[PDB]
Paper text:
We describe two genetically similar [name]-1 bnAb clonotypes from the same individual that exhibit different developmental paths toward broad neutralization activity. HA is a trimeric glycoprotein that is critical for viral entry and is composed of a globular head domain atop a more elongated stem domain. The HA head domain contains the receptor-binding site that engages sialoside receptors on host cells and is highly diverse among subtypes, whereas the stem domain carries the machinery for virus-host membrane fusion and is relatively conserved. Two HA stem-directed bnAb clonotypes, A and B, were elicited upon vaccination with H5N1 and H7N9 from a single donor (Andrews et al., 2017). Both clonotypes were encoded by germline genes [name]-1, DH3-3, and Vκ3-20 with the same CDR H3 and CDR L3 lengths.
We describe [name]-1 clonotype A, which started as a largely group 2-specific clonotype and then gained cross-reactivity to group 1 through somatic mutations. In agreement with the binding profiles of isolated clones from each clonotype, the early intermediate of clonotype A primarily recognized group 2 HA, whereas the early intermediate of clonotype B was specific to group 1 HA. Somatic mutations G100cT and S100fY on CDR H3 would stabilize the conformation of CDR H3. Specifically, mutation of Gly100c to Thr100c would help to rigidify CDR H3, whereas mutation of Ser100f to Tyr100f may acquire a π–π stacking interaction with Tyr49 of the light chain. Residues 100c and 100f are both too distant to interact directly with HA.
Numbering used by the authors:
A (entry chain H): 1 to 31, 31A, 31B, 32 to 52, 52A, 52B, 53 to 82, 82A, ...
B (entry chain L): 1 to 30, 30A, 31 to 95, 95A, 95B, 96 to 213
Write the structure that this text describes.
Amino acid sequence: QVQLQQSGPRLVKPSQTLSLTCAISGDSVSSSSAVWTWIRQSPSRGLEWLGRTYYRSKWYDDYAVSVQGRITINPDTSKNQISLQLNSVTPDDTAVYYCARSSINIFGVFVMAMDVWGQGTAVTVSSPSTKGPSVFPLAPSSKSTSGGTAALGCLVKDYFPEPVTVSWNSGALTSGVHTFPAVLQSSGLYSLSSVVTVPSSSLGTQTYICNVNHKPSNTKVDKRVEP
Amino acid sequence: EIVLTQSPGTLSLSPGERVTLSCRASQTVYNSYLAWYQQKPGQAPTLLIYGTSTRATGVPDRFSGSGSGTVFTLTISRLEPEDFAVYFCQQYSTSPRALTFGGGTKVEIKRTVAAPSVFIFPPSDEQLKSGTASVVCLLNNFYPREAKVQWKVDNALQSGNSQESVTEQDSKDSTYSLSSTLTLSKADYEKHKVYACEVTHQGLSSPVTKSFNRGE
């Protein structure tokens, strides 16, 4: 089908340039039946349209008033992708950035309802350097597992910026997983926990590994958790 | 520039109930140009309705859109637990070329009270080698969200040295979980023996305490 694959998370220093890419599969970027758009989302301001590009015998760009003058959205037909360049960023540009397609045409007008979305790119505008996490096991006591249920986890500590991804057993274990929102420590570094409940009768026969990936620092850690 | 105002901001309703979400536009939005999206935690929004009233491909029949002019409505005929999400309206204007979203309505799922299961985790030996001790308390699968965590060290109530966070409502069982971290220096952690997390919640007949003894 149609999939939009975006850049991984980005850390950008204030006053510098954000550059993102959105690689398209299952459609042509130059399709006269498509419009390609960038939208961002922040907790403080919500969902905000940034601009669109589309090909109709020639390339067109339309940008939102809020960012006109520091935004470019360029297609690349050889890579079948669109980009986003946002200049002179400030902390107000910290957001999750989405690319999306709109193809719905009502009475000859592209009504700009977005039918396919990329996965989002978490962008942090801040001056500190990246730092990868330390990963520590959360091992349940012997007694706590005397019941039917064992709680296991990983503490993912002292990283910057967000986000981190945590999986269990390389994605094979999803039931009962809870990965919590990170908290910001007085050091300016984030700390997060991820836990899973499993049958105590498995603790001897089944291995449990938390897979931690902090893409901004290229840190990958696989921590076995043994009660 | 058309502003879309969504109401209410948050709703808490039982499965099986009818949900009515409102979107008010600061000026007329023509029918072709009003859309609705559903956004579940950690995911991009997905299109639910477009052209005011047309169900997007694959959308369950329980979702319907209506309205005109400046007042638009999204209805969920019978709420299901998986419908936990933020719902957004969106307008496109052709002249001037503009695209805006409402602020969202968060639909939370009302379920029966559920007591948390509680677990306490000592700091790992690995972390201690580094000079800091993190003690973690887990409150698993409870409802409603209100919960009290009290840390005690050698029976002294702790204050100012913990942080906590809470998951979003589970899409299946509609519960919350909460993680609290008590952070001590290694020196302080080694000065004391009994570490306890005491949990108060509507679903617990009396508070639950989980504890361990350092070194045991």
